[model samples]
Target chain A: DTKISSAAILGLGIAFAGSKNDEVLGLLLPIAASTDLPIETAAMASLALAHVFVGTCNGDITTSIMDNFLERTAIELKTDWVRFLALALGILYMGQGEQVDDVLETISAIEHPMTSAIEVLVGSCAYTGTG
Target chain B: MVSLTFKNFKKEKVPLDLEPSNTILETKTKLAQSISCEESQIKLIYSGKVLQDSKTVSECGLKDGDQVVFMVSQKKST
Candidate 1:
């Protein structure tokens, strides 16, 4: 099943961490954007996470992730895959200490078990290792 | 074994083959995998009773060709 291929994408992202390779981004962007084919959504979650985390908080890169999170996530109950994008966001802004206050406001504004947990995670991860 | 027809929130039709002994959560697990959503996000109602997560297909008295209506909690944020 093509769904099985999603995990392998994540593995490549992990093994190639800190590379910030454009090739990986090119491949994953389309996959992540295919919301109807939900398995692609799952795969894109892992790939976005693996491709975007370089601790630099690049604007275009971070902007894409935010758009995906908002688009892919459901209203009353956010999808689990979309929540993973929030995790990627946390890592993207690592040690930026309240630099992501706007994100916190928006993500936390979501009221559901799925996003409620995400609220705490983004905050903790964004401010992580600062103390 | 039974053949189940699911009506999703969008009124989309999905077909599944399963054993009557399957737990509701297990059914939801498979459905979530196929559809790529969360188990908790789904609400299944059969014969006017909302099926509990732990209830089995047999316990719920679901038989082959029975239809279950499901609603998804996922929606667009305002």
Candidate 2:
């Protein structure tokens, strides 16, 4: 996601779609949670992570992404971009039940406009399931 | 299925066994993992142009032992 561009990021996601390949994790996970990366790149990388790890309840991935998602909401000024990330988080944790508990609790305490929008998506996605 | 020998710009060859039905995008993902980069950073040059992502291994006119030229991207030197 750093030395590479977003197209590569999406390709990685589609190529690995739901395989949960560890090697793909190694390549994408860091960039998904990377603080130094350009925001757009990081967002795309996080969504790619979702594509690979969707519904698997992989805690290592969810934990990192949730933290990064929250941090981005608190800092990233663009409401539009943050929503996609939240959706990615939603899709990744879809139907994992308690896996989203901490996230919902944490988001409820926050004040960003996007944080509140995330409330429905995160809680619902954890319950609604995804493709 | 076919085994591919990817010849990188660095002159390193990483051979991969994969299905001919796999799309080029999928192939780049395989190579990206093999070489530790994002798939977008990888370029697979075949007969005419860089292989398009939607193209299948067979559509690229490739087969076992066929060597595809590989290129990797780096951060722009600003």
Candidate 3:
């Protein structure tokens, strides 16, 4: 299909992962909302890392960076390119540790792929799910 | 025991009372404990020399009331 390989988005993810600067988010969230699938996924990946690191620092993603990608995920579950980024963000959220679980559990009404990724990546694959 | 002042990333001062005979690793462990991080993540510099883990505090020519800075390693994603 598209020749774009998510490189730019991956760069965004790396930059956010290293610095967690809000300026990057200023550029990241918009691209994530408007770009094509490859670019969008990368932007989401970076945005997800920002949230994940924030979670690691005991900050809540839903309350901190209010924007399109996360807000959209909260409203309805995404399955296409949007879902990839959303799922990665959810995984990063779960990285904040056990105290955040109750918050994520109640944050959204829809069962998002973000949560699903958590279930798949952190749960079944990691063997850390509730038995 | 020598008195050492440690400055962390938050610019907070941590006072340490250490024996000169103590290894740098010991100092690292103590600093890490004070900062709530891992010893491996800590980098200690005194008098422009990077302190080695195996070297003794006295061997590094540390004096009483010396100021040492503690920096945490930056977290990076590969």
lDDT of each: 0.59, 0.63, 0.53
Greater-lDDT candidate between 1 and 3: 1
Estimate, for each residue in A1-131, the C-alpha lDDT of model 3 and write its tens digit: 64455666555556666776676655644444433335345444555555546554433233222223333443333445545554543555433245344333323222353444433443433224454
Instruction: Fill in the DockQ of model 1.
Output: 0.01
Task: Indicate the residue-level lDDT of A5 in model 2.
Answer: 68
- Using TM-score as the measure, name the better of candidate 2 and candidate 3: 2
TM-score of each: 0.38, 0.46, 0.39
Alpha-carbon RMSD to native, per candidate:
15.8, 18.7, 16.5
Could you tell me which 10 consecutive residues in candidate 3 chain B have the lowest summed lDDT? B69-78
> lDDT by residue for model 2 over A39-103, one digit each (tens)?
66676666655655555656556555544554454454544565566566666654636646645
Model 2's C-alpha root-mean-square deviation from the true structure amounts to 18.7
TM accuracy, model 2: 0.46
* Poorest lDDT segment (10 consecutive residues) of candidate 2 chain B: B69-78
For each candidate, the DockQ is 0.01, 0.01, 0.01
lDDT of 2 by residue, B1-78 (tens): 688887654346888877878888878988989878787645676632567887888888898877776555433223
Model 3 CAPRI quality = incorrect
Across B1-78, the per-residue lDDT of candidate 1 in tens digits comes to: 688986653346677677878888888887777778676656565643557887899987888878875544433223
Tens digit per residue, CA lDDT, model 1, A46-98: 54554545553444344344444545545444345554555566666656444
Give the C-alpha lDDT of model 1.
0.59
Which docking band does candidate 2 fall into?
incorrect
